[PDB]
A paper describes a structure:
To gain further insights into the mechanism of DPF-motif recognition by the μHD, we solved the crystal structures of the SGIP1 μHD in two different space groups. The two structures are similar to each other, and the minor differences in the secondary structure composition are probably due to crystal packing effects. The structure of the SGIP1 μHD adopts a topology similar to those of the previously determined μHD structures. However, the SGIP1 μHD possesses unique structural features that distinguish it from the other known μHD structures. Among these distinctive features, the most prominent one is the presence of the SGIP1/FCHo1/FCHo2-specific insertion of a relatively long α-helix (α2) between β6 and β7. Due to this insertion, the loop between α2 and β7 and the N-terminal part of β7 also adopt conformations strikingly different from those in other μHDs. Since these regions contain critical Eps15 interacting residues (see below), these unique structural features of the SGIP1 μHD are functionally relevant.
Author numbering: 554 to 828
């Protein structure tokens, strides 16, 4: 009635996992997880009680901050608390004039948009080799001058994510050299693309709940006209929603704002496996 509005803001932690597997030797697995924290602001609002009295401070705390190996806050929009009484959380103050400036500008440049996203934090999540990959991979090739056999073994890895959630739209793509004429063996079903000379398996979901507890194999045998094939990296895609790999969370400090939603998701970035 005479009260400072609560202002609606959305938050997102979006993380990307890059992994390289080599044969079945977990020691040579190389993992890099990057991420960003994005704040989204509803249309044009910008000032919703900013004049008299002053606009509410937008301040937030990142929970489980120590899980991040490296962090780069947006230098135009944020300052934070030093120290670093390493208490695992970190408080950030948003520069309100620079935010108002910023939210006015894109509103002029994306004027038909309902919402404006702002990159608040870019980061890298501490990883520990294969333990940190959500989908462990191992690939093996047998290259005959006249034939090629391919096996890919995968395992859903529970302990890579803060909460156990499914990997969605999982794709396994492998280019097959050597002039394939036909595939004479394949399991489970896959698609062979003659134009790009590569095979593709799609699995809708992979989790603890999956038919095999998320452990499985992909097998194919190819007949060649101009072999041998040379092993090429398997390239994998997947996305997941409802969890991060970091386990970081976000909370508001003081009044003025409410998180309409805090989205957490991760997806494979460059996610490869060599023979
Ligand atoms: Zn209002
Ligand atoms: Zn580093
Ligand atoms: Zn500041
Ligand atoms: Zn700082
Ligand atoms: Zn700007
Ligand atoms: Zn970005
Ligand atoms: Zn709290």
């Amino acid at each position: 009635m005479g009260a400072q509005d609560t202002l609606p803001v959305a938050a997102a932690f979006t993380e990307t996992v890059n992994a390289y597997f080599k044969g079945a030797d977990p020691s040579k697995c190389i993992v890099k997880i990057t991420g960003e924290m994005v704040l989204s602001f509803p249309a044009g609002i910008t000032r919703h009680f900013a004049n008299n009295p002053s606009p509410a401070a937008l301040t937030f705390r990142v929970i489980n901050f120590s899980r991040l190996e490296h962090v780069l806050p947006n230098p135009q929009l944020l300052c934070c608390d030093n120290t670093q009484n390493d208490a695992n959380t970190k408080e950030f103050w948003v520069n309100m004039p620079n935010l108002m400036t910023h939210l006015k500008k894109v509103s002029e440049q994306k004027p038909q948009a309902t919402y404006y996203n702002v990159d608040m934090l870019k980061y890298q999540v501490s990883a520990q080799g294969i333990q940190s990959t959500p989908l462990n991979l191992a690939v093996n090739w047998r290259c005959e001058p006249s034939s090629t056999d391919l096996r890919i073994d995968y395992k859903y890895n529970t302990d890579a994510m803060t909460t156990a959630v499914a990997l969605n739209n999982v794709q396994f793509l492998v280019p097959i050299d050597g002039g394939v004429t036909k595939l004479q063996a394949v399991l489970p079903p896959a698609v062979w693309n003659a134009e790009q000379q590569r095979i593709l398996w799609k699995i809708p979901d992979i989790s603890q709940k999956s038919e095999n507890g998320g452990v499985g194999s992909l097998l194919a045998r190819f007949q060649l006209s101009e072999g041998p094939s040379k092993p090429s990296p398997l390239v994998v895609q997947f996305t997941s929603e409802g969890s991060t790999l970091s386990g970081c969370d976000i909370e508001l400090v003081g009044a003025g704002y409410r998180f309409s939603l805090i989205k957490k998701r991760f997806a494979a970035g460059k996610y490869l496996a060599d023979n």
